[PDB]
Design a protein around this ligand. Structure first.
Ligand SMILES: O=c1ccn([C@@H]2O[C@H](COP(=O)(O)OP(=O)(O)O[C@H]3O[C@H](CO)[C@@H](O)[C@H](O)[C@H]3O)[C@@H](O)[C@H]2O)c(=O)[nH]1
Length: 422
């Protein structure tokens, strides 16, 4: 029999790709797939055969949602300046109790009211939501609700705090301070969540509590098995996820083929791509560059080719290296295709992804704070001729191909939708 399945996710970006991915698996099984989101992403959602519902059309009049949406361009421009200037520890000191995304919590009241009305009218059999924190609607609606996590999942364990970029090699004494700062700002998030939940008259829960089922997307071979098991009811999905013609300009240029992409959001800060691409001019290699929304004003040299948006998943099998911001989706796409990574983390959970790449010998972390031409060129030389990095990367690529976590997770989704229990 057929299920009505409702997806939602935060405004943006990055929280749709995993939802769209689970979405497709479920569509193939003959389920009616709804997606409550924003007009701005209606095309991507409808192109996957899903039914679009504008969150904005189900707003309560006091909370029209658009008033309270974050200026995530402003936050990213600010994040770049601070990440250029500051060590991780200085970043957490200069934040001064302010949490990476707790400012977004008070703002989410309108989204909560809309999801409340949308579930009530459309009566889904199950909801899935990719948020940075749990919302009260997820515990009031008359169907089961599955939190979907695409961020680095270190937050699902009783280990070092998320957002720190802690290495497994970092001795306790070295991380003590940054982790105190990280736990302090975690309590500002609990404190904001307490207010959001009290407003809706809903018993407070942890921001990443899963009542019945939670799905985190992360490769098994990167998952934090050294920290034991994730929080109650969280299940791992290893990955959610045409052709590519190589540019004429890079034909008959020396070296291997390197993809550069700092993601849609950090790329909008032109200074970021300019300080990466400037030294790569004299790197004896060919670069395809995702130049971002303001890519028109990015200087590309004779050894590079760029477009604002690239078919990343089609490109990746062809390259020998990926210079990434360390977003979870870029990491998994990269590893699926068996390509090593240079991670230059820009924000939040990317610090954890960057350090996971380096710790597991999948590539290198190169922070904006310690960044130089010479260091980027040497990292490129090192990762391209490190036989052990290639072997670890090939190992993850095979595991990601060989997964039945897709079948297991679909089944748990369907079972939960049907029985209202697992
Ligand atoms: O030219 C481009 C640039 C990007 N992409 C796609 O855009 C997505 C990028 O996702 P990701 O690498 O995770 O970057 P963000 O969208 O910035 O990810 C946000 O959300 C993720 C959670 O899913 C977090 O891990 C990140 O830290 C956060 O920045 C991927 O599907 C890419 O294939 C393209 O197809 N072409």
């Amino acid at each position: 029999k057929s299920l009505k399945i409702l997806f939602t996710a935060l405004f943006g970006p990055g929280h749709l790709n995993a939802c769209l991915g689970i979405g497709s698996l479920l569509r193939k099984r003959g389920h009616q797939i709804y997606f409550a989101h924003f007009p701005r992403h209606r095309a991507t959602i409808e192109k996957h055969g899903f039914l679009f519902i504008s969150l904005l059309d189900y707003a309560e009049p006091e909370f029209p949602i658009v008033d309270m949406l974050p200026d995530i361009g402003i936050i990213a421009k600010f994040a770049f300046e601070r990440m250029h200037k500051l060590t991780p520890l200085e970043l957490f000191r200069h934040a001064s109790g302010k949490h990476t995304f707790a400012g977004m919590v008070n703002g989410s009241k309108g989204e909560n009211y809309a999801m409340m009305k949308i579930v009530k009218e459309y009566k889904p059999d199950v909801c899935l939501a990719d948020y940075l924190f749990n919302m009260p609607w997820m515990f009031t609606v008359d169907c089961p609700v599955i939190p979907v996590k695409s961020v680095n999942p270190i937050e699902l364990y009783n280990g070092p705090p998320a957002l720190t970029g802690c290495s497994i090699h970092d001795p306790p004494s070295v991380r003590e301070e940054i982790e105190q700062l990280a736990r302090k700002s975690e309590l500002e998030l609990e404190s904001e969540l307490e207010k959001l939940f009290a407003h809706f008259n809903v018993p407070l829960v942890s921001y990443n509590y899963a009542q019945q089922l939670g799905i985190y997307i992360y490769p098994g071979p990167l998952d934090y098995k050294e920290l034991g098991s994730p929080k109650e009811n969280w299940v791992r999905l290893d990955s959610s996820i045409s052709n590519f013609e190589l540019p004429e300009k890079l034909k008959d240029k020396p070296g291997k083929l390197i993809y550069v992409s700092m993601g849609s959001l950090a790329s909008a800060v032109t200074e970021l791509l300019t300080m990466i691409l400037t030294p790569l001019a004299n790197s004896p290699h060919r670069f395809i560059v995702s130049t971002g929304p303001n890519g028109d004003s990015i200087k590309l040299y004779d050894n590079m080719w760029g477009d604002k948006f690239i078919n990343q998943v089609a490109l990746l099998p062809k390259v020998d290296l990926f210079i990434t911001h360390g977003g979870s989706n870029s990491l998994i796409e990269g590893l699926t295709a068996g390509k090593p990574l240079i991670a230059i983390p820009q924000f939040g959970d990317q610090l954890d992804n960057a350090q996971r790449i380096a710790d597991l010998g999948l590539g290198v972390r190169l922070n904006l704070h310690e960044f130089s031409g010479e260091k980027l060129l040497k990292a490129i030389e090192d990762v391209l001729n490190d036989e052990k990095i290639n072997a670890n990367v090939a190992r993850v690529s095979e595991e990601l191909k060989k997964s039945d976590s897709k079948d297991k997770v679909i089944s748990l989704i369907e079972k939960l939708a049907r029985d209202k229990k697992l």
